Each structure stands twice: as C-alpha cells, then as structure tokens.
C-alpha cells in the first residue's frame with residue numbers, strides 16, 4: 001500500500017524551544033505512520049538507549065499511542081533517565097517506571113541552548129517532600145520546608161525555593177552542557193492500535 | 202527533620218548556587234588574565250565582590266547548624282569549611298586596617314624600585330632587574346650592595362607594618378579559637394574525629410623537626426661542597442670553618458641554590474641533557490609539547506584532556522597588542538572547564554612546566570565528582586606534589602629516549618647522574634632548611650616566643666644554627682629582613698613547600714615500586730604503568746573528602762610524612778659527596794668567622 005501521513009517527529013526533535021525538566025512537555029502521537037529508522041540512522045544523537053524493545057523491530061510493531069516527553073538536562077544527568085536510577089532528576093523531576101517500554105534519546109545541545117552570558121531559562125526541581133511517581137509532573141512552586149519551623153510563605157532559614165535555575169555556558173564541560181532528551185513511551189491498550197510502522201514494499 | 206538532613210539540604214543549595222557563582226568569578230579572572238583591560242579588571246572585581254559577599258552570607262547562614270550533631274564525615278567537613286569566620290570575626294575598623302595593611306604591603310613589594318645612591322636617573326625593580334643581578338653576577342661588592350640596599354629600603358618600610366600585622370593576625374586567630382596565627386596555618390593539617398588517622402596541630406612542628414633532623418646530614422655535606430666551590434670562586438671571603446655569606450647563594454633571599462649549578466658543577470666537561478636544540482630542529486610547537494604531555498598521562502592510565510581544554514586554553518603568547526600574565530597557571534574554572542594559561546616557549550623548562558601544570562589539571566579533573574566545597578587537595582602539599590612527580594618522571598633520560606627527543610645511543614654514565622642529582626639537590630634539598638627556618642621563625646613570632654626587640658638577633662641566630670648562612674654585616678631592629686620575600690609579605694603559608702618536597706619523593710617511591718622499576722629511584726619513569734596510575738588516581742579521586750593521612754595510606758602505605766624516600770633519591774649523591782668531603786670540613790660554626 002502507498003503510504004502517507006507520517007508521524008510528526010519534526011515538531012518534537014527539531015523544535016526551536018524545549019521545555020524545562022520540571023515542566024517536561026508530553027505530546028501524544030496517534031493516527032499516523034511512525035518511521036523510526038529516520039531517528040535511529042541519524043548520527044546527531046549521543047544516546048539512543050532503548051529499554052524493553054529493540055530499534056530494528058520498532059518499524060514493524062504497532063502501538064496504540066506514542067508518548068513523546070521532551071526536556072533539557074545536564075550532561076552528567078542523562079544516566080538518570082533510566083529505570084531504577086537515583087538522583088535529583090529521577091527522584092524530583094522526571095521518574096521512569098521499572099517496567100518501562102520505550103526509548104530514551106538524548107543529544108548535545110550546546111549550540112542552541114547555551115549563550116555567552118549564560119542561559120538560565122531551564123529550571124529543575126531540587127527539593128520535594130517525597131519522590132515522584134512514574135510519569136508524574138510536578139509544577140508546584142510552594143516553598144520547601146526542610147525544618148520544623150513553619151515556612152509561612154517567606155524564603156528564610158531552613159525554607160528553600162524548590163525550582164533552581166540551570167547555568168549553560170558554551171565553554172562548559174561535556175558533563176555540564178545542555179542535553180535535549182526525548183523519551184518515547186510505547187503502550188498497547190485494548191483499543192485498536194493505530195500507530196503502526198510502515199509496511200515496506 | 203533532623204539537623205543532619207537540614208545541613209545536607211543546605212549544602213545542596215550551597216553547592217548548586219556556588220558552582221555557578223564561582224564559575225562567573227573564575228571566568229572573569231580568566232578574561233582579565235588573557236586580556237588585561239580596565240573593564241576586565243572592573244568585571245573581575247565585581248565578580249570577586251559578589252563571590253565574597255555570597256560566601257559571607259552563606260557562612261552566616263551555615264553557622265546556625267551545630268557541628269556536634271552531624272555524624273557524616275563529608276557533611277561535617279563541608280560545614281567546617283563553610284563555618285570558618287576568617288577575618289569576619291574581627292571588628293570592622295580592625296578588619297579595614299588589616300586589609301589596608303595587606304594592600305600596602307602588596308604595593309610596596311610589587312612596586313619596590315631600588316638603585317645606587319648618586320646615580321638615581323634610572324632604577325631597577327625586583328623582577329627582572331634585581332633577579333638577574335643576584336642570579337648571574339660574580340662580583341662580591343655588587344651583590345652585597347644589591348642585597349643590603351633592597352633589605353634596607355624594603356625592611357625599613359615594612360617593619361612597623363609587620364609589627365601591626367602580627368598583632369592583628371593574632372587578634373583574629375584568638376578570636377577564632379586558635380592559639381595564634383601559626384596555629385591557624387597549622388590547622389590545614391588538622392584531622393579530627395577519625396579513629397587512628399587523627400592528626401593534631403601540635404604534631405606538625407614535631408614531625409617537621411623529626412624529618413629535618415634526618416635532612417641535616419645530607420644538607421651538611423651539600424653545604425660543605427657548595428662552601429668549597431664558593432671558596433674557589435671567591436678566594437678570601439669564605440672561611441673553611443664558617444657559614445656561607447648570604448648574598449652569594451644565587452637568589453635574593455637564599456630560597457633556591459639552583460643558580461649556583463654553573464659554579465658548583467661536578468663535571469663541567471661532560472655534557473648536559475639539554476634537549477632544546479633537538480626540539481628546535483624538529484620544529485616542536487607548543488601544541489606538540491602539550492600533546493606529548495597528554496600522551497604521557499594516557500600512558501599511565503589517566504584520562505585525556507577535554508575538548509574545552511584544547512579550544513579554550515592559551516598555550517602561546519598572544520602578541521604585543523594583547524597583554525597577558527606570563528606565569529604558567531592551571532585553572533579549574535568550574536562546571537568541567539579546565540584550562541592552562543602558559544606562554545609556552547620551545548625549551549626544556551617549558552616542557553617540564555607543561556607536564557607540571559597538566560598534572561595540576563589531572564588533579565583538578567579527578568575530584569570534579571566531589572561536592573564543590575571539597576574540591577581541593579587533601580592538604581596544601583599534595584596539589585603541588587602531584588605536579589612535581591610528573592616533572593620528575595618527564596625529566597629522566599629514559600622518557601626522553603622513549604619520546605624521541607634524545608638520541609637512543611646517548612651514554613648515561615655515573616658522572617651525568619651525579620651532576621643531575623646535584624642540580625636537583627641545589628633546587629630541592631637547598632630550599633628545605635630555608636623553608637623550615639622561615640616557618641619556625643614565623644611560628645615563634647606568632648606564638649610570642651620572640652619579643653619584638655629581639656626578632657633579628659634571634660633570626661640570624663636561627664639562620665646560622667639551621668641554614669648555615671651568615672649575615673654579611675650586622676642588622677639592628679630597624680630592618681625587616683624576612684618580609685623582603687614574596688610569600689611572607691603577602692600573607693602566604695610557607696610550610697607547603699617543605700611538605701610538598703617530602704610528599705614528592707614519597708609518591709615517587711610508591712609509584713616506582715608500583716611500576717616495578719628495579720634501579721635507582723632517580724632513574725625511574727612512571728610511563729606505561731597502569732597500576733601506578735590506578736594507585737595515583739585512587740588518591741586523586743578523593744580530593745578533600747578524606748583526611749590527608751588516609752590519602753597517604755592509599756598511596757605509600759604510611760600514615761605520616763616520611764623523609765626516607767628523599768634520602769633514598771639522593772643516595773648516590775650522598776655517597777659521592779661524602780667521598781668528596783674528606784679533605785674539607787663538614788658542618789659549620791655559628792661564630793662570625795667568615796665575615797661580619
């Protein structure tokens with residue numbers, strides 16, 4: 001069959017702006033044909049680690065929906081976007097389930113997301129009372145209470161603001177340079193699967 | 202909840218907002234150093250003021266968490282580092298007076314120009330006007346004039362200033378729960394709370410005396426040989442039974458004896474190992490010097506330099522139009538940015554300096570995983586020692602033959618090893634009594650052992666007793682002879698060089714034993730040895746997280762600084778010097794026998 005209506009992967013990977021890791025964007029991809037070989041054969045990605053499925057058979061399998069979660073993290077924090085990991089990003093910003101089927105794609109973005117004065121537009125949640133559940137988004141800006149005293153709204157002693165900005169300079173090391181991460185989540189539900197791979201001729 | 206969790210959250214908040222501010226300060230300092238312009242000076246000053254004010258506010262916030270309720274060693278170490286008052290405990294009037302005194306001493310030392318009376322039309326500054334005269338002249342009265350005139354002007358200006366400085370620093374230290382300023386300096390080596398690895402501030406003086414008592418025979422034989430050669434050079438001034446005249450040691454203060462290698466050479470007719478012409482013939486650029494250094498560090502197993510290092514470092518002099526500081530410096534700017542600022546020439550000295558500074562860079566890179574306030578050396582000695590070991594390994598004839606800079610048929614006989622060891626002794630052994638005597642004198646001044654009216658009578662008495670160097674003419678109390686040196690006049694600790702020198706050869710023995718070198722210690726090269734690099738990197742990765750005693754256990758297997766590796770390094774030279782001193786008299790007399 002002649003195929004059209006490819007899945008819109010251009011508006012996620014080639015987006016002019018990415019979201020912050022605390023407020024990571026989720027785009028639901030449905031009712032199209034997903035060509036995954038375009039992503040896999042690209043040389044622009046530093047991490048293309050797939051958990052629970054292999055990239056070769058992605059272009060054949062069919063899924064109900066594809067969830068594209070997009071954010072920016074540091075170079076040293078790409079390791080924490082994996083099942084079972086521990087860190088600031090995993091516990092307080094973006095948590096992946098252990099039974100996760102999907103792919104974590106990350107690439108260096110020092111060219112776009114770093115400016116000479118410092119790019120402070122990307123923020124991360126540094127403190128939360130409890131760890132996040134898998135696929136939870138916390139965009140609350142309530143003052144963290146680290147001590148018995150009632151914070152009472154004011155940032156004083158033992159009371160800190162949970163969202164801390166990130167500093168991005170072009171001269172930083174590879175472990176501090178901004179990395180754009182897109183996590184694709186593949187699920188199969190009782191509804192008929194509509195995100196199928198292309199059928200080769 | 203608990204105090205410890207509160208301190209951990211506060212430390213996370215600190216490390217996060219302090220790494221970026223430190224990076225801004227460091228980047229402004231780099232932009233000043235590579236580009237000396239007034240706006241860059243203003244930007245550097247503004248960033249430094251922001252950094253200092255942020256540290257003051259974080260220290261003020263940090264003091265509110267009591268130390269005794271924290272059991273985690275790393276958290277306690279960071280809180281101890283942050284909670285230090287420094288000069289903040291002192292009153293604002295006295296703090297401003299102390300800062301003014303420090304600045305004016307810096308200006309007097311840096312901008313001090315002295316020349317001969319009756320010829321005042323032009324005068325010579327310390328660098329390089331007086332350095333060249335002290336290092337290269339062979340005239341007795343010229344060196345005497347330069348030495349006495351510089352100590353007359355600088356000491357007579359700095360003596361009241363130093364008298365105020367000792368009182369203010371003692372006041373700050375006693376306000377900070379220390380006995381004196383000497384205890385404050387010795388507190389860098391203080392380890393408390395670790396079972397068995399504890400080190401006391403009072404143990405440092407005892408360990409330094411205990412090591413120096415074993416240094417003394419080698420130094421006495423070296424002093425006798427140098428005395429005989431200087432007696433040959435200057436026929437009547439130097440006595441066979443007395444101390445060396447102060448102005449004849451090849452440097453302004455007596456810090457190094459390395460400028461006497463030409464006068465005191467054992468075998469002048471035999472060649473040196475200078476490789477400068479070989480690099481010039483093969484057109485070695487500064488980039489090739491750093492690439493060869495990188496090859497050396499990957500040979501031993503350490504990580505290679507980052508992309509940011511090659512892109513952002515300045516390894517060549519920029520030009521006449523753009524002004525830069527010429528001093529070689531390794532910069533850990535923060536956030537994974539490591540750079541070397543060196544005006545590299547095609548010389549052996551620059552090549553060894555490149556190895557030394559890349560060693561500093563490797564040490565900085567190793568503890569990047571550690572928290573921000575623990576990103577330092579375990580003590581002040583280790584940071585310099587890890588560069589000096591690379592300098593030691595690179596200068597060996599085996600490394601030079603391996604990298605192609607030396608001919609493979611170059612003959613390494615005993616005479617070349619003797620003269621090389623003598624040069625290393627003049628640089629390394631000769632600085633040890635001067636360093637120990639200077640620090641002991643400053644500790645006794647801070648402790649109050651020496652009253653203000655007896656500072657110089659004791660000082661020369663110490664110099665005759667320890668260094669074996671006599672004053673050319675007597676000096677009264679209007680002189681301030683110690684403060685003519687850069688470190689003492691600008692409030693710097695001086696025991697780091699003594700500790701660095703001992704740690705250098707302890708590390709060298711440990712790595713050479715790890716690398717299975719089977720010969721003399723000075724002939725040892727640590728290239729191609731993965732296990733030696735692993736043993737080094739185990740200590741390198743710790744940074745300031747662990748006590749320096751534990752780090753030394755990690756490398757050499759000892760819990761304390763030791764003097765036997767240094768003596769083992771210079772054992773061929775020690776036997777040769779003992780043989781050569783049969784006619785002459787080893788040791789000196791403290792009396793005024795040569796000249797006074």
Ligand SMILES: *[C@@H]1O[C@H](CO)[C@@H](O)[C@H](O)[C@H]1NC(C)=O
Pocket residue numbers: 009010013014038039042
């Ligand atoms: C995104 O940008 C790269 C850069 O050239 C381009 O080759 C690619 O086709 C774009 N789209 C996707 C979906 O990767």
Ligand SMILES: *[C@@H]1O[C@H](CO)[C@@H](O)[C@H](O)[C@H]1NC(C)=O
Pocket residue numbers: 236238523
């Ligand atoms: C050095 O400073 C001058 C004057 O601000 C500027 O024009 C020049 O581009 C700078 N060069 C570098 C390498 O920073």
Ligand SMILES: *[C@@H]1O[C@H](CO)[C@@H](O)[C@H](O)[C@H]1NC(C)=O
Pocket residue numbers: 273274275276
């Ligand atoms: C001390 O705190 C660090 C956090 O920096 C933690 O990783 C470590 O396990 C703690 N050590 C102990 C003995 O609790």
Ligand SMILES: *[C@@H]1O[C@H](CO)[C@@H](O)[C@H](O)[C@H]1NC(C)=O
Pocket residue numbers: 264284285286290376377378
């Ligand atoms: C620092 O100074 C303050 C004010 O005098 C004092 O309360 C605090 O105990 C001092 N801390 C240390 C470590 O000396």
Ligand SMILES: *[C@@H]1O[C@H](CO)[C@@H](O)[C@H](O)[C@H]1NC(C)=O
Pocket residue numbers: 505506507508
């Ligand atoms: C440093 O070493 C790694 C692995 O050995 C290598 O991939 C990298 O290219 C090296 N760096 C440079 C600048 O060549």
Ligand SMILES: *[C@@H]1O[C@H](CO)[C@@H](O)[C@H](O)[C@H]1NC(C)=O
Pocket residue numbers: 615616619777
């Ligand atoms: C060097 O070795 C030769 C060969 O035995 C010996 O004659 C000479 O005295 C030695 N020189 C020194 C300085 O040890």
Ligand SMILES: *[C@@H]1O[C@H](CO)[C@@H](O)[C@H](O)[C@H]1NC(C)=O
Pocket residue numbers: 500599603728729
């Ligand atoms: C170290 O290893 C390199 C690469 O194998 C080799 O060329 C070099 O000669 C070795 N060094 C020595 C001293 O043998």
